[PDB]
Amino acid sequence: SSSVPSQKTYQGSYGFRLGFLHSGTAKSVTCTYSPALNKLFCQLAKTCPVQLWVDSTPPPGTRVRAMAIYKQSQHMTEVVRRCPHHERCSDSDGLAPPQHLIRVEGNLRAEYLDDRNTFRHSVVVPCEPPEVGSDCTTIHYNYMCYSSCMGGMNRRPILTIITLEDSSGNLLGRDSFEVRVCACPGRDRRTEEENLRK
Amino acid sequence: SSVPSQKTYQGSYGFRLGFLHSGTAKSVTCTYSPALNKLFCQLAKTCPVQLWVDSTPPPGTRVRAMAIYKQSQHMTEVVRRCPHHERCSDSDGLAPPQHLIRVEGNLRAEYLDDRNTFRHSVVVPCEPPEVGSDCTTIHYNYMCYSSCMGGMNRRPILTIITLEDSSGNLLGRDSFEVRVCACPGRDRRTEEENLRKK
Numbered sequence: 001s002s003s004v005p006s007q008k009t010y011q012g013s014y015g016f017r018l019g020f021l022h023s024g025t026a027k028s029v030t031c032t033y034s035p036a037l038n039k040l041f042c043q044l045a046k047t048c049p050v051q052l053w054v055d056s057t058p059p060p061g062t063r064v065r066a067m068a069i070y071k072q073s074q075h076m077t078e079v080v081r082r083c084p085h086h087e088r089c090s091d092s093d094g095l096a097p098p099q100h101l102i103r104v105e106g107n108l109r110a111e112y113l114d115d116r117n118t119f120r121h122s123v124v125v126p127c128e129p130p131e132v133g134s135d136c137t138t139i140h141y142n143y144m145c146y147s148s149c150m151g152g153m154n155r156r157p158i159l160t161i162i163t164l165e166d167s168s169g170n171l172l173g174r175d176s177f178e179v180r181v182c183a184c185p186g187r188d189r190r191t192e193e194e195n196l197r198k
Numbered sequence: 199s200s201v202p203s204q205k206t207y208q209g210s211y212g213f214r215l216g217f218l219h220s221g222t223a224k225s226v227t228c229t230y231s232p233a234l235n236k237l238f239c240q241l242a243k244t245c246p247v248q249l250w251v252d253s254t255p256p257p258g259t260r261v262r263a264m265a266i267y268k269q270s271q272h273m274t275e276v277v278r279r280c281p282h283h284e285r286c287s288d289s290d291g292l293a294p295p296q297h298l299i300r301v302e303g304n305l306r307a308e309y310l311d312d313r314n315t316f317r318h319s320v321v322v323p324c325e326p327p328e329v330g331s332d333c334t335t336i337h338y339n340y341m342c343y344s345s346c347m348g349g350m351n352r353r354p355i356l357t358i359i360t361l362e363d364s365s366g367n368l369l370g371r372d373s374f375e376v377r378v379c380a381c382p383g384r385d386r387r388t389e390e391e392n393l394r395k396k
């Protein structure tokens with residue numbers, strides 16, 4: 001039903017790429033990234049830190065956008081949205097529409113887009129230089145449905161596409177990662193990595 | 199209701215909170231857990247909170263306190279006193295009976311019912327430390343138990359403390375969880391043991 005945004009990795013002029021913390025797989029972890037799977041595992045509505053790395057500084061007014069798509073070919077034309085249960089939660093922070101799967105945490109300049117032509121959802125923030133004593137910028141994302149939610153993702157894998165954009169929205173860079181939103185991210189990362197090694 | 203930001207922000211003046219070291223004896227009425235960033239206190243008892251800055255903010259700076267529910271699914275609900283305690287004859291002459299958080303012993307305290315969000319807050323002028331001291335102390339009271347039915351109803355809350363200029367613009371922000379309970383020392387010990395075992 002909708003055109004599919006590109007997921008092709010594109011570093012661009014500024015050498016744009018993502019990075020992830022090394023959180024491990026203990027029972028207490030709430031967000032953990034698998035480099036072998038290029039896959040983030042996270043709990044519902046919990047902080048997911050994503051690093052933005054560049055080789056050179058983009059202009060003021062550069063923005064960073066996040067959008068989810070279904071990974072599998074037969075589902076990629078379907079808009080990823082919150083399930084019929086969670087979209088009816090009165091849990092908006094006042095910026096995010098209740099249908100949106102991906103939110104930004106702790107940024108009052110976050111903007112949420114419902115695309116008038118494709119109906120896809122995305123959240124965009126200004127790109128900012130690293131804080132004092134840091135080499136990268138970090139964005140905190142929250143995912144507001146479980147991968148297993150019926151009538152929503154319904155156990156289908158998704159990708160998050162992160163795009164670096166100029167102030168008009170033109171593409172400057174692109175990267176992406178798979179996401180599973182689940183109750184036990186550490187256990188599930190261990191299982192999927194063990195499965196991969198066999 | 200939209201959700202106030204809880205992001206820690208030291209700002210230009212290096213603003214942050216501090217708490218005295220009270221211990222967990224059975225006789226303690228107010229005790230702070232740094233490991234949990236959580237204050238445990240009895241109903242309507244004095245809670246001293248230290249205000250620290252690295253440099254002096256301008257005259258007319260104010261300090262506001264507001265409570266929100268900690269859990270995502272409840273953050274949009276206004277935190278207020280339960281149907282029982284809002285009808286207690288316990289007015290101090292300044293605080294409206296519906297407000298959970300009071301400032302004790304400050305005749306310049308002002309209480310706000312926000313006309314757009316309906317949230318409650320209490321604000322006082324920010325003052326420099328007394329002679330011989332290095333920080334300023336505010337005394338708060340929490341006027342409902344965490345367990346009160348029809349009020350917090352066993353849901354955790356956060357207190358957000360904001361440093362504001364004379365127009366109400368943000369200069370600094372800090373926050374902490376609160377449990378209002380009959381046995382704060384015992385409950386702090388239990389929750390800290392639970393955290394270690396996790």
Ligand SMILES: *c1ncc(C#N)nc1C
Nearest residue numbers: 052057127128129130137
């Ligand atoms: C965005 N804007 C600026 C900078 C720098 N330096 N980095 C990003 C990711």
Ligand SMILES: *c1ncc(C#N)nc1C
Nearest residue numbers: 249254255324325326334
């Ligand atoms: C508020 N106003 C002034 C000062 C100083 N010095 N501190 C506060 C917390």
Ligand SMILES: *c1ncc(C#N)nc1C
Nearest residue numbers: 224225380381382383384
């Ligand atoms: C809870 N904690 C301490 C004490 C005392 N003394 N009593 C209770 C109920």
Ligand SMILES: [Zn+2]
Nearest residue numbers: 083086145149
């Ligand atoms: Zn859902």
Ligand SMILES: [Zn+2]
Nearest residue numbers: 280283342346
């Ligand atoms: Zn009550």
